[PDB]
Amino acid sequence: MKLSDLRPNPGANKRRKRVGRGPGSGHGKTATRGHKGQKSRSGGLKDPRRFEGGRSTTLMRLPKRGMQGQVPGEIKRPRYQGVNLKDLARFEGEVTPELLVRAGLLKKGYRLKILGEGEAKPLKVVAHAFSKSALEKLKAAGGEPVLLE
Amino acid sequence: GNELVRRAARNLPWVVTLAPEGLNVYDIVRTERLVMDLDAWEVFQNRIG
Amino acid sequence: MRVKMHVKKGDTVLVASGKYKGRVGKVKEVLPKKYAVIVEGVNIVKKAVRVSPKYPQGGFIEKEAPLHASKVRPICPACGKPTRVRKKFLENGKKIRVCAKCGGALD
Amino acid sequence: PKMKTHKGAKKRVKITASGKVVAMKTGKRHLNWQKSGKEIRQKGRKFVLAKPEAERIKLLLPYE
Amino acid sequence: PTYIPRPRPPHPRL
RNA sequence: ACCCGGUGAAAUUGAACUGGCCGUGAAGAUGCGGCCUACCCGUGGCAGGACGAAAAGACCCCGUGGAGCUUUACUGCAGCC
RNA sequence: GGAUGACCCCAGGCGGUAGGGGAGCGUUCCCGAUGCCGAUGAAGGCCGACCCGCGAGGGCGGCUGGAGGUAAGGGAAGUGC
RNA sequence: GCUGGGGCUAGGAGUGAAAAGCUAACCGAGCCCGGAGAUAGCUGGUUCUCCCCGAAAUGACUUUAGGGUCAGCCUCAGGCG
RNA sequence: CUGUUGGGAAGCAGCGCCAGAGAGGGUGAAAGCCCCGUAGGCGAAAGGUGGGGGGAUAGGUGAGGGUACCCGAGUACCCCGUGGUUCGUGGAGCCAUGGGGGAAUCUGGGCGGACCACCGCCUAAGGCUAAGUACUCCGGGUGACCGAUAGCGCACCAGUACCGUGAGGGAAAGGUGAAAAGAACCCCGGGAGGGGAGUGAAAUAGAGCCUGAAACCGUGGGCUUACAAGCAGUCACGGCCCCGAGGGGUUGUGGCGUGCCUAUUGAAGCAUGAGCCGGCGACUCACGGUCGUGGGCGAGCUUAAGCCGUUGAGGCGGAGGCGUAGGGAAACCGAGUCCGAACAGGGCGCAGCGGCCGCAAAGUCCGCGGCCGUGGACCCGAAACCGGGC
RNA sequence: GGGGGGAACCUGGGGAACUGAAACAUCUCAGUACCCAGAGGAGAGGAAAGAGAAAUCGACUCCCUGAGUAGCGGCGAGCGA
Ligand SMILES: [Mg+2]
Ligand SMILES: [Mg+2]
Ligand SMILES: [Mg+2]
Ligand SMILES: [Mg+2]
Ligand SMILES: [Mg+2]
Ligand SMILES: [Mg+2]
Ligand SMILES: [Mg+2]
Ligand SMILES: [Mg+2]
Ligand SMILES: [Mg+2]
Ligand SMILES: [Mg+2]
Ligand SMILES: [Mg+2]
Ligand SMILES: [Mg+2]
Ligand SMILES: [Mg+2]
Ligand SMILES: [Mg+2]
Ligand SMILES: [Mg+2]
Ligand SMILES: [Mg+2]
Ligand SMILES: [Mg+2]
Ligand SMILES: [Mg+2]
Ligand SMILES: [Mg+2]
Ligand SMILES: [Mg+2]
Ligand SMILES: [Mg+2]
Ligand SMILES: [Mg+2]
Ligand SMILES: [Mg+2]
Ligand SMILES: [Mg+2]
Ligand SMILES: [Mg+2]
Ligand SMILES: [Mg+2]
Ligand SMILES: [Mg+2]
Ligand SMILES: [Mg+2]
Ligand SMILES: [Mg+2]
Ligand SMILES: [Mg+2]
Ligand SMILES: [Mg+2]
Ligand SMILES: [Mg+2]
Ligand SMILES: [Mg+2]
Ligand SMILES: [Mg+2]
Ligand SMILES: [Mg+2]
Ligand SMILES: [Mg+2]
Ligand SMILES: [Mg+2]
Ligand SMILES: [Mg+2]
Ligand SMILES: [Mg+2]
Ligand SMILES: [Mg+2]
Ligand SMILES: [Mg+2]
Ligand SMILES: [Mg+2]
Ligand SMILES: [Mg+2]
Ligand SMILES: [Mg+2]
Ligand SMILES: [Mg+2]
Ligand SMILES: [Mg+2]
Ligand SMILES: [Mg+2]
Ligand SMILES: [Mg+2]
Ligand SMILES: [Mg+2]
Ligand SMILES: [Mg+2]
Ligand SMILES: [Mg+2]
Ligand SMILES: [Mg+2]
Ligand SMILES: [Mg+2]
Ligand SMILES: [Mg+2]
Ligand SMILES: [Mg+2]
Ligand SMILES: [Mg+2]
Ligand SMILES: [Mg+2]
Ligand SMILES: [Mg+2]
Ligand SMILES: [Mg+2]
Ligand SMILES: [Mg+2]
Ligand SMILES: [Mg+2]
Ligand SMILES: [Mg+2]
Ligand SMILES: [Mg+2]
Ligand SMILES: [Mg+2]
Ligand SMILES: [Mg+2]
Ligand SMILES: [Mg+2]
Ligand SMILES: [Mg+2]
Ligand SMILES: [Mg+2]
Ligand SMILES: [Mg+2]
Ligand SMILES: [Mg+2]
Ligand SMILES: [Mg+2]
Ligand SMILES: [Mg+2]
Ligand SMILES: [Mg+2]
Ligand SMILES: [Mg+2]
Ligand SMILES: [Mg+2]
Ligand SMILES: [Mg+2]
Ligand SMILES: [Mg+2]
Ligand SMILES: [Mg+2]
Ligand SMILES: [Mg+2]
Ligand SMILES: [Mg+2]
Ligand SMILES: [Mg+2]
Ligand SMILES: [Mg+2]
Ligand SMILES: [Mg+2]
Ligand SMILES: [Mg+2]
Ligand SMILES: [Mg+2]
Ligand SMILES: [Mg+2]
Ligand SMILES: [Mg+2]
Ligand SMILES: [Mg+2]
Ligand SMILES: [Mg+2]
Ligand SMILES: [Mg+2]
Ligand SMILES: [Mg+2]
Ligand SMILES: [Mg+2]
Ligand SMILES: [Mg+2]
Ligand SMILES: [Mg+2]
Ligand SMILES: [Mg+2]
Ligand SMILES: [Mg+2]
Ligand SMILES: [Mg+2]
Ligand SMILES: [Mg+2]
Ligand SMILES: [Mg+2]
Ligand SMILES: [Mg+2]
Ligand SMILES: [Mg+2]
Ligand SMILES: [Mg+2]
Ligand SMILES: [Mg+2]
Ligand SMILES: [Mg+2]
Ligand SMILES: [Mg+2]
Ligand SMILES: [Mg+2]
Ligand SMILES: [Mg+2]
Ligand SMILES: [Mg+2]
Ligand SMILES: [Mg+2]
Ligand SMILES: [Mg+2]
Ligand SMILES: [Mg+2]
Ligand SMILES: [Mg+2]
Ligand SMILES: [Mg+2]
Ligand SMILES: [Mg+2]
Ligand SMILES: [Mg+2]
Ligand SMILES: [Mg+2]
Ligand SMILES: [Mg+2]
Ligand SMILES: [Mg+2]
Ligand SMILES: [Mg+2]
Ligand SMILES: [Mg+2]
Ligand SMILES: [Mg+2]
Ligand SMILES: [Mg+2]
Ligand SMILES: [Mg+2]
Ligand SMILES: [Mg+2]
Ligand SMILES: [Mg+2]
Ligand SMILES: [Mg+2]
Ligand SMILES: [Mg+2]
Ligand SMILES: [Mg+2]
Ligand SMILES: [Mg+2]
Ligand SMILES: [Mg+2]
Ligand SMILES: [Mg+2]
Ligand SMILES: [Mg+2]
Ligand SMILES: [Mg+2]
Ligand SMILES: [Mg+2]
Ligand SMILES: [Mg+2]
Ligand SMILES: [Mg+2]
Ligand SMILES: [Mg+2]
Ligand SMILES: [Mg+2]
Ligand SMILES: [Mg+2]
Ligand SMILES: [Mg+2]
Ligand SMILES: [Mg+2]
Ligand SMILES: [Mg+2]
Ligand SMILES: [Mg+2]
Ligand SMILES: [Mg+2]
Ligand SMILES: [Mg+2]
Ligand SMILES: [Mg+2]
Ligand SMILES: [Mg+2]
Ligand SMILES: [Mg+2]
Ligand SMILES: [Mg+2]
Ligand SMILES: [Mg+2]
Ligand SMILES: [Mg+2]
Ligand SMILES: [Mg+2]
Ligand SMILES: [Mg+2]
Ligand SMILES: [Mg+2]
Ligand SMILES: [Mg+2]
Ligand SMILES: [Mg+2]
Ligand SMILES: [Mg+2]
Ligand SMILES: [Mg+2]
Ligand SMILES: [Mg+2]
Ligand SMILES: [Mg+2]
Ligand SMILES: [Mg+2]
Ligand SMILES: [Mg+2]
Ligand SMILES: [Mg+2]
Ligand SMILES: [Mg+2]
Ligand SMILES: [Mg+2]
Ligand SMILES: [Mg+2]
Ligand SMILES: [Mg+2]
Ligand SMILES: [Mg+2]
Ligand SMILES: [Mg+2]
Ligand SMILES: [Mg+2]
Ligand SMILES: [Mg+2]
Ligand SMILES: [Mg+2]
Ligand SMILES: [Mg+2]
Ligand SMILES: [Mg+2]
Ligand SMILES: [Mg+2]
Ligand SMILES: [Mg+2]
Ligand SMILES: [Mg+2]
Ligand SMILES: [Mg+2]
Ligand SMILES: [Mg+2]
Ligand SMILES: [Mg+2]
Ligand SMILES: [Mg+2]
Ligand SMILES: [Mg+2]
Ligand SMILES: [Mg+2]
Ligand SMILES: [Mg+2]
Ligand SMILES: [Mg+2]
Ligand SMILES: [Mg+2]
Ligand SMILES: [Mg+2]
Ligand SMILES: [Mg+2]
Ligand SMILES: [Mg+2]
Ligand SMILES: [Mg+2]
Ligand SMILES: [Mg+2]
Ligand SMILES: [Mg+2]
Ligand SMILES: [Mg+2]
Ligand SMILES: [Mg+2]
Ligand SMILES: [Mg+2]
Ligand SMILES: [Mg+2]
Ligand SMILES: [Mg+2]
Ligand SMILES: [Mg+2]
Ligand SMILES: [Mg+2]
Ligand SMILES: [Mg+2]
Ligand SMILES: [Mg+2]
Ligand SMILES: [Mg+2]
Ligand SMILES: [Mg+2]
Ligand SMILES: [Mg+2]
Ligand SMILES: [Mg+2]
Ligand SMILES: [Mg+2]
Ligand SMILES: [Mg+2]
Ligand SMILES: [Mg+2]
Ligand SMILES: [Mg+2]
Ligand SMILES: [Mg+2]
Ligand SMILES: [Mg+2]
Ligand SMILES: [Mg+2]
Ligand SMILES: [Mg+2]
Ligand SMILES: [Mg+2]
Ligand SMILES: [Mg+2]
Ligand SMILES: [Mg+2]
Ligand SMILES: [Mg+2]
Ligand SMILES: [Mg+2]
Ligand SMILES: [Mg+2]
Ligand SMILES: [Mg+2]
Ligand SMILES: [Mg+2]
Ligand SMILES: [Mg+2]
Ligand SMILES: [Mg+2]
Ligand SMILES: [Mg+2]
Ligand SMILES: [Zn+2]
């Protein structure tokens, strides 16, 4: 393979859409913009995600719900993240939180909660919490849940 | 990685000269043949490990 | 700081290119700030002169044109060859140009 | 620069796991004395927006 | 473009 | 003003090989139809047309445009109490 | 049909504004290029009733010009009035 | 009363035997540079070629009515058949 | 180095050579070896710097027990009026402070978001402090940066000429040739200008100078036109001229025929714009998003700032981000959860293809394209508003 | 010893409006533009009467991330540790 052979696959480097370049392109004169509106102008329309022509918008006529918060903001709580039994299928011997972060299952800064979905395995599983189902599955499969705090 | 050997072959219009740490595909592909140390080949094996 | 002149006034040069390739002659003059020289009897041209004192009856006169100073190569006063110019430091600390074919001095 | 979340949306709406937009029913904030029990009861429920209106609002929650 | 000669007033078409 | 000698502008100007009537046509046609009339090119004159030139209509309306002005419009500020 | 555009056959579609989609041409610049074309003539200009292409264009030939230009294949845009 | 020379008062400010006059040949708020590429739901303009398809001028709501949001109507890709 | 074409060799041909130097610019065209350079090395009496190496000085450094002397005042602190912070009066703390009041010296005081207690953190009302950070008048290096309408306003004697009372505004204008060899001399002419002569490879390269497009003006030649009705063409035939069973030029007669653009329900339109020609001239970039697409990897994917290398070499770096679980206002529970008394109902959720290997795929990273948000965001255009000056 | 100058950069003292909110006043633009003072090759800041929940950390400045998060907001537009 020499340089004059290096080629992108068909469909990898598409050409652009150049408007306002003649009659034959089919994209000229008005540049596919139509005629004479606010949308045809440079700057165009207000945010079409929100603006509805001056009427009360679809979003703003809907009620708010729940605690939104107040200064000084978020109250520091212990956070829990669940991991299903089926996720633990790969390890043997021991399982801890710090180990599951290294596997890319438990984001840092969260306390570990083991969940039910899946099959238990005779494993020592050290965690901050277990669900009713994960506890039952574990003990019944020979595993040893050691609840840490 | 032989400082001396790269000095010798620098000026040849048919030799691109290079250290193993600099092995790159654009320079492998723009040349017709490839020649390496057993030392530089060992280094290449690390990098694609 | 100064235009470099591998060739000085008064030494013998071969003219290596142009209409007068082959010619040999004494460097009659060196014009640094125009990078050029004048070789005795080389690059002759015809110059119209006016009827005026010093040139009454007028007509034309021959003058030697300037050659680009790179077209000229000095001839070693020992081995008699054209050459490039080396440098050599004498024991006085001073420095002279020296022929490259043999080892002679061009001053 | 990077887009900012529309906080009015985040205070009013939730994107569900499959990407639907769920809001609270309107019309029981007040004026409730003559309203049926069926009316208030049903208006305490969540509801799913129509597809066009949902997808606009979803664009206002770029980092959920 | 030195001095701008002001144009004559229109005929009053009222 | 006119003619001859000398010097020599301008706004304007899609291109022009640029006639009448009766019709037709975006509703007032040198340019379409049917007739009529008419050899080619100027010079001095007259202003009916070229919806003649000039000025992106002042009127009028539209714009969630602007500016001056008013008040027992709103909301402030100086000032004074 | 043959075997997955290799070409052949048969049938049908193919007016078009706003606009959607597809395929191309040309401009400047980069890799290709320490290469290749080049004073036995570069680019640019001016002709052509010739060659290829549906077209945008590309060739080739003559004149002019006098020193640059740049392939197959790709890459990036101050890219066509 | 007219007038020369030398001076003072200016931009929401001056001066005005009052005309919103005048403040360097356009003053209902001077000129310059700057903010600044203000903003303009308005008017104008928008450049190579070929191929397929191909609208709308309606409804609801809208300090909305020559502007918008959703629907209708066009196009492309994938799926169903 | 030689030969060869050539005005000129560096082209081409033959035979060599250097290279830690084949970056680049020159030289009469295209040169590693002719020139200037390049790689690699060397270099300061003098002034500047000197953050590194060295030395000097200033400066520094204990343990109990007692004592309760000191520890930053119109200060803390409280209140009133404000500012700063993400905080727009809010449950409004904290930091700052214009006004009023006004302490204490560690058993003193401030803070941890009103306030109180508990538990902690920290010691206000004196000062100083390198480095890592910012900018580019200046110097150098390098461009998938411009190439004289571009690039700075200025390639050139430009912040000039010119305009303005002034602040201020603000241009145009580059190129003979390898070398001036820049045309002696003679002819017409007042000169200008030309015609010869001469130089040159070339003089429609002659200084009003490379190339020399177009509009525009003219001289000469071919066809044609003074009874003709016209968006100027097109179709047909015939005549004449030219090139040599055909083609090119011209147009006499006959046929047909409502400019371009724009805006419009509708324009040849007596609606807009344009005298004509040349050049300048309008959908982009960044970061985010959302689909689509080309690849990599896949219950995983991926790094940012930096760091090392390189001097158009790549690598390291896992902080962090997205995904792997949802439901609920939340406490919380979890393949479920929320409403509810509910084992009721319902809302929102939960579950690959062949033969353990192969293909694939959640997802994610990068490239590419469409479209969206934020910016001037397709380009040009107000009347105005504000600031500091004149 | 000072005074004056210096393209941008820097700290302090003052401090707009167009604009956005498809009107507007709070809000935005923005402590931006700009005016003034001072400083230097940098300036500012700096050795905890700090953070804020870790039974933790240990001056300041700068870049990455945290994060368009926590929040703030005619809970609008937007603002944003
Ligand atoms: Mg395309
Ligand atoms: Mg591209
Ligand atoms: Mg294009
Ligand atoms: Mg086109
Ligand atoms: Mg179209
Ligand atoms: Mg338009
Ligand atoms: Mg569009
Ligand atoms: Mg339009
Ligand atoms: Mg329209
Ligand atoms: Mg229209
Ligand atoms: Mg238009
Ligand atoms: Mg319209
Ligand atoms: Mg429109
Ligand atoms: Mg729309
Ligand atoms: Mg604009
Ligand atoms: Mg707009
Ligand atoms: Mg509410
Ligand atoms: Mg929350
Ligand atoms: Mg080399
Ligand atoms: Mg090499
Ligand atoms: Mg090579
Ligand atoms: Mg000496
Ligand atoms: Mg809100
Ligand atoms: Mg919610
Ligand atoms: Mg209620
Ligand atoms: Mg009732
Ligand atoms: Mg009831
Ligand atoms: Mg209920
Ligand atoms: Mg996030
Ligand atoms: Mg007469
Ligand atoms: Mg006369
Ligand atoms: Mg005269
Ligand atoms: Mg004129
Ligand atoms: Mg015409
Ligand atoms: Mg005509
Ligand atoms: Mg006529
Ligand atoms: Mg009629
Ligand atoms: Mg009528
Ligand atoms: Mg008529
Ligand atoms: Mg007529
Ligand atoms: Mg007509
Ligand atoms: Mg006609
Ligand atoms: Mg007709
Ligand atoms: Mg007629
Ligand atoms: Mg007729
Ligand atoms: Mg008649
Ligand atoms: Mg007349
Ligand atoms: Mg008349
Ligand atoms: Mg008259
Ligand atoms: Mg008339
Ligand atoms: Mg008239
Ligand atoms: Mg008129
Ligand atoms: Mg007119
Ligand atoms: Mg106008
Ligand atoms: Mg008008
Ligand atoms: Mg007018
Ligand atoms: Mg009206
Ligand atoms: Mg009006
Ligand atoms: Mg109104
Ligand atoms: Mg309106
Ligand atoms: Mg108004
Ligand atoms: Mg007003
Ligand atoms: Mg005003
Ligand atoms: Mg009073
Ligand atoms: Mg067919
Ligand atoms: Mg078809
Ligand atoms: Mg058909
Ligand atoms: Mg078609
Ligand atoms: Mg192309
Ligand atoms: Mg390539
Ligand atoms: Mg190259
Ligand atoms: Mg050749
Ligand atoms: Mg030649
Ligand atoms: Mg030739
Ligand atoms: Mg070219
Ligand atoms: Mg070119
Ligand atoms: Mg051609
Ligand atoms: Mg040519
Ligand atoms: Mg060259
Ligand atoms: Mg190329
Ligand atoms: Mg190519
Ligand atoms: Mg452009
Ligand atoms: Mg007097
Ligand atoms: Mg007087
Ligand atoms: Mg006076
Ligand atoms: Mg006065
Ligand atoms: Mg005054
Ligand atoms: Mg005064
Ligand atoms: Mg003043
Ligand atoms: Mg004023
Ligand atoms: Mg004003
Ligand atoms: Mg006043
Ligand atoms: Mg008076
Ligand atoms: Mg004036
Ligand atoms: Mg005046
Ligand atoms: Mg004015
Ligand atoms: Mg005003
Ligand atoms: Mg005035
Ligand atoms: Mg200024
Ligand atoms: Mg602004
Ligand atoms: Mg702007
Ligand atoms: Mg406005
Ligand atoms: Mg307007
Ligand atoms: Mg069709
Ligand atoms: Mg309303
Ligand atoms: Mg209206
Ligand atoms: Mg409107
Ligand atoms: Mg729609
Ligand atoms: Mg349909
Ligand atoms: Mg010869
Ligand atoms: Mg030779
Ligand atoms: Mg050879
Ligand atoms: Mg080198
Ligand atoms: Mg070179
Ligand atoms: Mg050169
Ligand atoms: Mg060569
Ligand atoms: Mg070359
Ligand atoms: Mg060379
Ligand atoms: Mg070279
Ligand atoms: Mg060196
Ligand atoms: Mg050196
Ligand atoms: Mg005491
Ligand atoms: Mg103290
Ligand atoms: Mg306090
Ligand atoms: Mg206070
Ligand atoms: Mg505040
Ligand atoms: Mg406050
Ligand atoms: Mg408020
Ligand atoms: Mg509040
Ligand atoms: Mg506060
Ligand atoms: Mg105070
Ligand atoms: Mg204490
Ligand atoms: Mg105390
Ligand atoms: Mg305090
Ligand atoms: Mg407290
Ligand atoms: Mg604290
Ligand atoms: Mg503390
Ligand atoms: Mg202290
Ligand atoms: Mg300091
Ligand atoms: Mg410092
Ligand atoms: Mg510092
Ligand atoms: Mg520089
Ligand atoms: Mg260029
Ligand atoms: Mg160039
Ligand atoms: Mg020029
Ligand atoms: Mg220029
Ligand atoms: Mg030029
Ligand atoms: Mg140009
Ligand atoms: Mg240019
Ligand atoms: Mg300059
Ligand atoms: Mg200029
Ligand atoms: Mg001046
Ligand atoms: Mg001048
Ligand atoms: Mg003047
Ligand atoms: Mg003056
Ligand atoms: Mg200029
Ligand atoms: Mg020259
Ligand atoms: Mg010259
Ligand atoms: Mg030459
Ligand atoms: Mg000269
Ligand atoms: Mg005479
Ligand atoms: Mg003469
Ligand atoms: Mg003559
Ligand atoms: Mg002559
Ligand atoms: Mg020749
Ligand atoms: Mg010529
Ligand atoms: Mg020439
Ligand atoms: Mg030349
Ligand atoms: Mg010429
Ligand atoms: Mg000429
Ligand atoms: Mg003629
Ligand atoms: Mg007759
Ligand atoms: Mg006749
Ligand atoms: Mg016929
Ligand atoms: Mg014929
Ligand atoms: Mg014929
Ligand atoms: Mg005819
Ligand atoms: Mg046209
Ligand atoms: Mg119109
Ligand atoms: Mg109209
Ligand atoms: Mg007409
Ligand atoms: Mg007309
Ligand atoms: Mg009109
Ligand atoms: Mg017209
Ligand atoms: Mg109009
Ligand atoms: Mg128009
Ligand atoms: Mg006109
Ligand atoms: Mg013309
Ligand atoms: Mg043009
Ligand atoms: Mg676009
Ligand atoms: Mg994208
Ligand atoms: Mg992608
Ligand atoms: Mg990968
Ligand atoms: Mg990775
Ligand atoms: Mg309950
Ligand atoms: Mg359920
Ligand atoms: Mg269900
Ligand atoms: Mg795969
Ligand atoms: Mg993928
Ligand atoms: Mg979109
Ligand atoms: Mg912007
Ligand atoms: Mg823009
Ligand atoms: Mg855009
Ligand atoms: Mg105002
Ligand atoms: Mg205002
Ligand atoms: Mg002002
Ligand atoms: Mg002022
Ligand atoms: Mg100073
Ligand atoms: Mg300041
Ligand atoms: Mg003020
Ligand atoms: Mg405002
Ligand atoms: Mg604005
Ligand atoms: Mg305002
Ligand atoms: Mg507004
Ligand atoms: Mg608005
Ligand atoms: Mg208004
Ligand atoms: Mg602010
Ligand atoms: Mg400040
Ligand atoms: Mg100073
Ligand atoms: Mg520094
Ligand atoms: Mg300090
Ligand atoms: Mg201290
Ligand atoms: Mg805000
Ligand atoms: Mg702010
Ligand atoms: Zn010798």
Side-chain angles (χ1 to χ4, degrees), chain A residues 1-138 140-149, chain B, chain C residues 1-32 34-53 55-56 58-107, chain D residues 1-44 46-64, chain E:
Chain A
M1 194 119 194
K2 63 185 284 278
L3 267 185
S4 82
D5 298 333
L6 284 177
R7 243 175 311 270
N9 292 344
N13 195 3
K14 206 165 163 57
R15 280 164 220 246
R16 283 191 194 171
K17 180 182 192 187
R18 286 174 97 230
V19 300
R21 287 311 179 273
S25 74
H27 297 169
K29 186 197 186 191
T30 59
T32 76
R33 285 180 182 274
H35 282 288
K36 254 187 173 172
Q38 184 182 10
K39 192 180 184 171
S40 96
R41 311 291 162 189
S42 162
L45 315 158
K46 292 190 65 77
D47 186 354
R49 304 174 296 165
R50 277 170 300 183
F51 192 68
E52 294 185 5
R55 85 202 169 189
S56 57
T57 59
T58 286
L59 178 56
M60 290 287 159
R61 306 164 74 259
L62 294 183
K64 311 166 74 192
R65 183 179 180 78
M67 309 182 224
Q68 308 320 319
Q70 58 285 305
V71 80
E74 192 179 78
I75 295 165
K76 205 197 188 310
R77 217 167 305 262
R79 292 308 159 198
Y80 295 100
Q81 171 176 330
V83 180
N84 282 307
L85 295 161
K86 75 205 202 318
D87 288 330
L88 306 190
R90 63 209 71 169
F91 318 98
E92 234 291 278
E94 185 134 346
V95 151
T96 56
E98 68 104 41
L99 186 154
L100 299 173
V101 319
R102 291 170 30 239
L105 319 172
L106 175 69
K107 319 252 189 182
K108 299 186 177 169
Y110 283 82
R111 291 183 183 189
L112 167 62
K113 186 175 185 181
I114 307 299
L115 285 189
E117 195 83 333
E119 292 293 274
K121 239 167 75 179
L123 270 154
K124 187 187 184 181
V125 191
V126 183
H128 302 75
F130 300 84
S131 59
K132 279 186 307 290
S133 193
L135 255 192
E136 235 171 335
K137 287 211 192 213
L138 201 49
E144 176 197 355
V146 168
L147 191 280
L148 54 51
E149 149 63 9
Chain B
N2 205 323
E3 298 254 348
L4 268 345
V5 166
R6 287 192 319 268
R7 269 124 82 120
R10 267 165 171 190
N11 213 38
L12 276 329
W14 46 280
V15 168
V16 181
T17 206
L18 230 192
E21 279 76 21
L23 202 47
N24 70 93
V25 351
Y26 171 69
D27 290 337
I28 288 161
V29 172
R30 71 186 244 259
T31 58
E32 265 156 329
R33 300 166 119 285
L34 223 192
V35 174
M36 307 194 195
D37 285 348
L38 275 184
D39 298 337
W41 171 264
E42 158 87 66
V43 156
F44 167 63
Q45 214 75 29
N46 287 191
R47 196 132 73 87
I48 62 164
Chain C
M1 200 224 74
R2 176 196 65 101
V3 198
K4 313 286 208 148
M5 289 297 158
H6 65 131
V7 137
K8 58 198 307 173
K9 167 181 198 155
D11 50 2
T12 300
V13 294
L14 154 68
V15 185
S17 69
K19 195 170 77 175
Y20 302 81
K21 53 177 174 287
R23 296 298 193 88
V24 181
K26 276 218 157 306
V27 174
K28 183 177 172 182
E29 192 188 7
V30 186
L31 306 99
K34 197 210 150 297
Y35 208 90
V37 294
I38 299 277
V39 182
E40 214 134 58
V42 185
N43 228 23
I44 260 300
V45 290
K46 184 166 168 181
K47 206 270 159 296
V49 287
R50 243 156 184 86
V51 153
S52 55
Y55 306 87
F60 305 85
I61 70 107
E62 288 183 328
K63 59 188 280 186
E64 296 138 313
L67 288 179
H68 190 265
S70 113
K71 318 175 68 50
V72 126
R73 306 174 62 188
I75 294 182
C76 162
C79 67
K81 315 199 58 53
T83 182
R84 294 175 270 108
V85 166
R86 270 189 175 89
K87 298 290 171 77
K88 182 148 267 63
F89 298 96
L90 299 175
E91 191 43 51
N92 188 17
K94 299 195 176 187
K95 185 185 58 182
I96 35 157
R97 317 173 312 189
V98 297
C99 151
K101 303 258 190 173
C102 79
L106 325 138
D107 315 4
Chain D
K2 61 184 183 199
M3 299 203 299
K4 308 177 150 183
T5 316
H6 187 276
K7 302 316 180 83
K10 200 164 187 286
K11 289 164 191 172
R12 267 173 255 256
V13 132
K14 170 162 177 157
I15 303 170
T16 67
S18 77
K20 314 185 183 179
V21 177
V22 162
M24 290 292 294
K25 275 287 182 184
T26 73
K28 54 174 279 186
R29 236 57 169 169
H30 65 172
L31 293 175
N32 284 12
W33 92 109
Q34 58 176 33
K35 275 155 184 183
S36 170
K38 176 181 152 188
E39 190 177 345
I40 279 119
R41 183 168 310 109
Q42 272 158 341
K43 296 216 170 177
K46 282 177 172 177
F47 85 95
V48 167
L49 297 179
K51 216 178 50 220
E53 298 302 333
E55 64 192 41
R56 293 170 84 208
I57 297 176
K58 242 183 306 168
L59 289 185
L60 305 188
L61 301 170
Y63 316 98
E64 300 305 328
Chain E
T2 126
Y3 146 65
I4 296 86
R6 192 221 223 277
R8 284 189 41 83
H11 283 136
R13 293 265 294 164
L14 319 155

